[PDB]
């Protein structure tokens with residue numbers, strides 16, 4: 001809405017690609033977020049001027065509650081710093097949630113295990129798993145109506161090799177001649193409306209599958225891939241956003257490892 005203020009930064013170079021080792025835009029013109037493609041100062045200004053609030057949701061059941069401390073502490077250091085953040089921790093052990101110190105303008109809600117609530121409390125929803133830790137910047141550059149994240153183990157793979165559900169009897173079915181990328185089932189998000197739209201579709205498709213006595217090879221991830229194939233994401237995050245250094249090392253194509261699994 002409102003105008004940006006005067007800002008001093010390097011002029012974009014029309015005749016100089018911002019990364020010549022990777023694809024930075026999809027065939028449907030959605031940017032693929034890699035380090036070096038964005039100026040965070042410009043983006044921070046745009047989103048702060050809109051007083052953007054980001055909801056971060058995580059489920060922590062049973063032994064997984066033990067990962068909450070590191071998850072939240074690192075999120076405090078790297079996730080949407082400077083912006084309004086609302087953490088939503090869904091757990092079966094409310095009293096076991098760690099007492100983590102939060103920066104100003106950030107809050108945490110513990111939900112024991114109300115979709116309308118999201119619509120009134122946050123502008124965007126980011127859905128991830130708890131057994132992870134932030135190691136570098138994860139900010140507003142990811143915000144968009146709907147985004148998926150390139151799976152770290154298959155970003156360089158051909159579609160035939162993707163572990164999509166291959167049985168036609170499943171709602172998540174994707175033939176060998178279809179598919180753009182293999183997205184992570186544990187790092188996606190977008191506007192509340194778009195995220196609820198995706199989860200609602202996934203929930204229904206999985207019910208149809210169980211009624212037909214079939215379970216997708218990679219469960220929710222298989223369905224998320226089917227959804228994003230038919231509903232193109234408006235932004236796609238590079239593997240920088242969900243990496244496993246123990247299993248994959250640190251490739252030259254990765255300038256930053258922002259969010260990683262905890263061994």
Ligand SMILES: CCCCCCO[C@@H]1O[C@H](CO)[C@H](O)[C@H](O)[C@H]1O[C@@H]1O[C@@H](C)[C@@H](O)[C@@H](O)[C@@H]1O
Pocket residue numbers: 151152153154163185218221243244247261
């Ligand atoms: C061919 C080499 C691929 C190496 C990555 C395998 O990752 C797993 O991929 C499947 C789909 O085929 C699922 O997405 C599964 O959750 C992935 O494993 C998990 O994520 C990877 C990155 C690693 O952190 C594993 O320890 C996790 O269990």
Ligand SMILES: O=c1ccn([C@@H]2O[C@H](COP(=O)(O)OP(=O)(O)O)[C@@H](O)[C@H]2O)c(=O)[nH]1
Pocket residue numbers: 059060061064129130131261
């Ligand atoms: O036997 C299992 C293993 C995992 N999960 C759930 O799946 C989520 C993600 O799984 P996992 O930790 O196995 O992820 P990965 O190793 O794929 O990173 C967890 O938060 C759990 O809620 C589960 O219900 N049963």
Ligand SMILES: [Hg+2]
Pocket residue numbers: 057125126127195
């Ligand atoms: Hg979510």
Ligand SMILES: [Hg+2]
Pocket residue numbers: 201202203205223224226227
């Ligand atoms: Hg789906």
Ligand SMILES: [Hg+2]
Pocket residue numbers: 199202203206220223
């Ligand atoms: Hg689902």
Ligand SMILES: [Hg+2]
Pocket residue numbers: 198199202203220221223224
């Ligand atoms: Hg899904």
